[PDB]
Amino acid sequence: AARRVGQLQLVTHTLKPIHPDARGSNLHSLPQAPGQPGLAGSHELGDRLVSDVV
DNA sequence: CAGGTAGACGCGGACATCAAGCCCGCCGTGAAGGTGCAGCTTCT
């Protein structure tokens, strides 16, 4: 199991929905809060979220 | 080559009730997955 690798424990970056045969980069970095009033995303100002793993 | 002016077209009252609306059987399947390693193969 320690020999078996592949995990990354993502938060907001899964390259695999975009044409799954694609060996790209996946990130675990939730973005900064937008300073502009109005729009919002990323599920980031409350109600803590689970972490994907690819 | 022409063909009218005027004025007005009613009120009332009512428009049904009864009873029931089926049963049977079934509903396609085939193809739409990636990653990692062991071993083979081909070439030098």
* Structural class designation: little secondary structure
Sheet bearing the most strands, described?
A: none
Q: What is the first-to-last residue Cα distance?
A: 16 Å
The helix count comes to 0
Helix content: under 10%
Quaternary structure state of the chains depicted: part of a larger assembly
Shape: elongated
What is the radius of gyration computed over CA atoms, rounded to a whole number of angstroms? 14 Å
Number of strands: 0
Work out the strand percent.
under 5%
PDB class: immune system/rna
Keywords: type I-F CRISPR RNA-guided surveillance complex, viral protein mimic, IMMUNE SYSTEM-RNA complex
Entry title: Structure of double-stranded target DNA engaged Csy complex from Pseudomonas aeruginosa (PA-14)
Name: CRISPR-associated protein Csy1
How does this model look, in words?
The PDB classes it as immune system/rna. The entry lists the keywords type I-F CRISPR RNA-guided surveillance complex, viral protein mimic, Csy-complex, IMMUNE SYSTEM-RNA complex. The entry is titled "Structure of double-stranded target DNA engaged Csy complex from Pseudomonas aeruginosa (PA-14)". The protein is low in regular secondary structure and 54 residues long. It is 0% helix and 0% strand. It has no helices and no strands. The radius of gyration is 14 Å and the shape is elongated. The protein binds one DNA strand of 44 nucleotides through loops.
